[PDB]
């Protein structure tokens, strides 16, 4: 019945004013990509940076089990597009946000499904 809440700990550490996790691996890319959130290859558009996924995963970086029951990682082995405005904290960004399952954009950072 006891499990560590790494997600909540990082959120609280951030709120208290701690420095975001560093050394997320930022890719060189054209920045003319699709802008989708998580992709097999960097897809940053003009307003995003692309990072190696593993290095942006709280669970990967902290050496802890993934919340998946299979323990599978959403990010490892792929690339995550982060809004340039949020690129100072890619782990925080991927933790706090969710990907639209229809268009693949970040909800609230590219997803327009809920506007037509």
């Amino acid at each position: 019945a006891f499990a560590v809440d790494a997600a909540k700990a990082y959120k609280d550490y951030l709120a208290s004013g701690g420095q975001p996790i560093t050394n997320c691996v930022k890719m060189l890319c054209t920045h003319t990509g699709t802008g989708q959130a998580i992709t097999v290859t960097p897809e940053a558009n003009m307003d995003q940076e692309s990072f190696g996924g593993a290095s942006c995963c709280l669970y990967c970086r902290c050496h802890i089990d993934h919340p998946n029951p299979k323990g599978f990682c959403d990010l490892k082995g792929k690339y995550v597009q982060i809004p340039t405005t949020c690129a100072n904290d890619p782990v925080g960004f991927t933790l706090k946000n969710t990907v639209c399952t229809v268009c693949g954009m970040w909800k609230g950072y590219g997803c327009s499904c809920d506007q037509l």
């Binding site: 050394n23 997320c24 691996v25 930022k26 890719m27 060189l28 890319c29 054209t30 097999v40 290859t41 960097p42 940076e49 190696g52 996924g53 593993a54 290095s55 995963c57 990967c60 970086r61 050496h63 490892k76 082995g77 792929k78 690339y79 690129a87």
Partner: protein
């Protein structure tokens, strides 16, 4: 002069043909630094330029390509080089990486421990090594051919590199091995490639292009390393980040290079010709299985 717009500089053929004596390496642009794009790590930049240069060679690029990357960890606990390799390689390429120290990676499989503990059933299409020990920078001691992980790398190439495969092995003034240079002559072509972002360093990547599994050319590796240092000593390379800003042609083209299994008796001049042109890989195409030896010890008394 247009060199500053290339990803790096490869050692010119005429320097490979000399018979120089080994000297100390004294780089004019030592301590100079290229201006990296905002927020880009040295190792991302360095690997990007390595891959950009490899894009100019006749690499075999089969379906279900197999790439193994040694020395892939960082004192940061992440694997920037692996992330560039995975970006560069066609989607689906099998990528294994390894390092002495723990790190989190985008590779499909990661093995932690000395490289000598790494074993694989299968053969590989490309081998990348960034293995290095900074303790070799000791300028107070003679600069002899080094063993250690270089002995592993030489055997790994001779035993587990597919015919037609390629390698890029990091060396420096003091981190080098004579047999590895000698093994360069077992490829259709070879060079020592220096990235423009790290040109103030005696680092280079020894690239063997399209493995033939037999000497095409007899190379004395003590002489060839002296030749490399001579080149570096007399050809200052201007630090440059330029090539990093144009990524439009970065991806390695999926050539679908053919893979066949063959026995040593079937490798004729026609096969060898295809191998040398990057149009054939010879290896089994079975499942890829790897392992790390673990030493078992009970320290209770």
């Amino acid at each position: 002069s247009s060199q500053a717009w290339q990803p790096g500089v490869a050692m010119p053929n005429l320097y490979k043909m000399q018979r120089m004596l080994l000297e100390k390496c004294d780089l004019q642009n030592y301590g100079d630094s290229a201006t990296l794009p905002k927020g880009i790590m040295m190792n991302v930049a360095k690997y990007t330029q390595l891959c950009q240069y490899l894009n100019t060679l006749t690499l075999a690029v089969p379906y279900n390509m197999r790439v193994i990357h040694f020395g892939a960890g960082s004192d940061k606990g992440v694997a920037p080089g692996t992330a560039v390799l995975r970006q560069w390689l066609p989607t689906g390429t099998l990528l294994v990486d390894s390092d002495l120290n723990d790190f989190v990676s985008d590779a499909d499989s990661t093995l932690i421990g000395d490289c000598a503990t790494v074993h694989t059933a299968n053969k590989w299409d490309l081998i990348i090594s960034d293995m290095y020990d900074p303790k070799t920078k000791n300028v107070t001691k003679e600069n002899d051919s080094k063993e250690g992980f270089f002995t592993y790398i030489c055997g790994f190439i001779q035993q587990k590199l597919a015919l037609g495969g390629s390698v890029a092995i990091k060396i420096t003034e003091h981190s080098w091995n004579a047999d590895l240079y000698k093994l360069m002559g077992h490829f259709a072509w070879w060079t020592a490639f220096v990235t423009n972002v790290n040109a103030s360093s005696s680092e280079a990547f020894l690239i063997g292009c399209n493995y033939l599994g037999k000497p095409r050319e007899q190379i004395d590796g003590y002489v060839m390393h002296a030749n490399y240092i001579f080149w570096r000593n007399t050809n200052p390379i201007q630090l440059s980040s330029y090539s990093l800003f144009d990524m439009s042609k970065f991806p390695l083209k999926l050539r679908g290079t053919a893979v066949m299994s063959l026995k040593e008796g079937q490798i004729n001049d026609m096969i060898l010709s295809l191998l040398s042109k990057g149009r054939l890989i010879i290896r089994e195409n079975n499942r890829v299985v790897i392992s790390s030896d673990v030493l078992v010890n009970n320290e209770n008394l």
